[PDB]
Design an enzyme around this catalytic site. Sequence first.
Site, PDB file in Angstrom:
ATOM      1  N   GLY A  20       2.965   6.172  10.170  1.00 36.18           N
ATOM      2  CA  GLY A  20       4.328   6.084   9.657  1.00 36.18           C
ATOM      3  C   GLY A  20       5.056   4.808  10.056  1.00 36.18           C
ATOM      4  O   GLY A  20       6.184   4.582   9.603  1.00 36.18           O
ATOM      5  N   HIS A  73       0.800  -1.234   0.000  1.00 39.02           N
ATOM      6  CA  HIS A  73       0.000   0.000   0.000  1.00 39.02           C
ATOM      7  C   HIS A  73       0.824   1.273   0.000  1.00 39.02           C
ATOM      8  O   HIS A  73       0.240   2.376  -0.013  1.00 39.02           O
ATOM      9  CB  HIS A  73      -1.062   0.038   1.098  1.00 39.02           C
ATOM     10  N   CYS A  88       4.065   1.689   9.379  1.00 40.40           N
ATOM     11  CA  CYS A  88       3.888   0.558   8.451  1.00 40.40           C
ATOM     12  C   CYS A  88       5.216   0.052   7.911  1.00 40.40           C
ATOM     13  O   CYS A  88       6.135   0.858   7.743  1.00 40.40           O
ATOM     14  CB  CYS A  88       2.929   0.924   7.328  1.00 40.40           C
TER      15      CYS A  88
HETATM   16 ZN   LIG Z   1       0.522   2.366   5.902  1.00 46.44          ZN
END
Ligand SMILES: [Zn+2]
Lengths: 304, 301
Positions: free
Chosen positions: B143, B41, B145
Amino acid sequence: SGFRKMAFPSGKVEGCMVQVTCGTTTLNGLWLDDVVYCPRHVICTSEDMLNPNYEDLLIRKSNHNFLVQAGNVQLRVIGHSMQNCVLKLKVDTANPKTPKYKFVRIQPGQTFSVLACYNGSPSGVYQCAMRPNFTIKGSFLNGSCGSVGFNIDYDCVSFCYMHHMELPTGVHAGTDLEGNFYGPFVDRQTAQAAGTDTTITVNVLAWLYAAVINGDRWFLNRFTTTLNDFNLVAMKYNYEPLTQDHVDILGPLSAQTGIAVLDMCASLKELLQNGMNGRTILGSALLEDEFTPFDVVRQCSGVT
Amino acid sequence: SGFRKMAFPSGKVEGCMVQVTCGTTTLNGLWLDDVVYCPRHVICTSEDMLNPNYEDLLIRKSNHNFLVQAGNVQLRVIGHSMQNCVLKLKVDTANPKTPKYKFVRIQPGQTFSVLACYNGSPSGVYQCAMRPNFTIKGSFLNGSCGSVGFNIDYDCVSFCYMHHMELPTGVHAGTDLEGNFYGPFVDRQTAQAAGTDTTITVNVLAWLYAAVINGDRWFLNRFTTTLNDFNLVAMKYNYEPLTQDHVDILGPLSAQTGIAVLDMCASLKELLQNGMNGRTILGSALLEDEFTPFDVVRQCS
Ligand SMILES: [Zn+2]
Ligand SMILES: [Cl-]
Ligand SMILES: [Zn+2]
Ligand SMILES: [Zn+2]
């Protein structure tokens, strides 16, 4: 979202751990520049620890009595001296992995990360607080002496603790990196008791703010109290006094949540009187006191 | 003595963290050899949150649309592929700090260390467990991820988790390093909810054995129980069923303490009935379930 007991990343400290042997005694050492730091009791046997004269024990030893190992490589010891309860072994090679560092002495209530080590090898990392009675509630087994505690600020490691012993209650005692003990303890296998411990009030308050930030609001009381009226109730439950300094330190968290510090004190006062009534706060059924206001801001702000 | 939520030393994973940017989206990547792994993503814009077709979004990208930074160095992307929900970016330089590693899929009840990262920089490390509902109770902000979960043995770093999202209850969801999500979760911002979270029974029992090893026995009793009667009671408190496999896994701890597994089960039944009554076990006023039998053995002996 979420709140965990989080430790600093330990990589900068892992590159400093070595094994120190003197006779049959083996423990951990910290290699910074061309010096290895370790507890002075490395020069003791089980029998010496009953009543050691470290002056005499060291005077009866030379550079040859010390064997330092950094992984597989042996480090040549070219000098030795004692600074309080720590031994400083000068070696012929500067640690290429030495990070930017300093030695700092912390106060009760402050937190730090511990890198538990055995035979010079890091095994785990955890977060703990220096108790108001100057002990730490660590997790250490035989061979863990010399393991260190630290904080990281930007890219500088502040070393604050070196592990030396376990008290009868299973709690731990150590020194700063200049060999000064935290607490009224001595490096001798003798009758030593940790004093009565208290709860770090400013830390419980910071953790209640973390709970609000994470959506836990059931405990909020907005019938504002004063510092004096709070302290009267707090001292009865074995909580440290809350100073105006502590109130000021709680400022940034107070502004963030819209809860004035004296309203959080009112909420904590009722929590002490009522108990938690079968409820939890941030996944805990007790009032957690091992998170400082800076730890809460840091974790709820994602500082690296 | 003592018992703490202990994480593995994070050094070997810190040397793998990089920052990945695609457009205005920035997250963390894991750089192993000449490949950077990150959540797919990273290619999503504000209009691709609810129903992204990742195959269609990715076909429109070129190598130079991915900016990878390792410290103060830009790495050049020379290839890209998608494997399930992870994006693999081939770069022209192999990470010289790549440790010996494996990618493993863990099961509910198992524990692992998480290295929380922002902009490719590590901020902290903590220990957690994969819940029976396939979520993790992490600590992650915007932030985070791409932050990974791992375990270390004597030879390698076993990567088991990559962070992808937060659910409405504040719990977290992610994938293994092959991009397969744990649980029925998807990388879409459509409303998703975690199933009922149950307590990891075998872990609570392991933690009670840790308390006995550390000198505390206040909670024990003179009773025993059959496995079925234990399960009939424990399930009334939302505890996961205890299987014979769990009983056998607790064998070494049972042999070290002299307390039969079914005798510890009887103690646990009584603790559920009575609560703590103002007492604590290993510094906690709740029954802790994020320590496996192996975490207890590592720390207690
Ligand atoms: Zn993310
Ligand atoms: Cl000492
Ligand atoms: Zn020792
Ligand atoms: Zn391995």
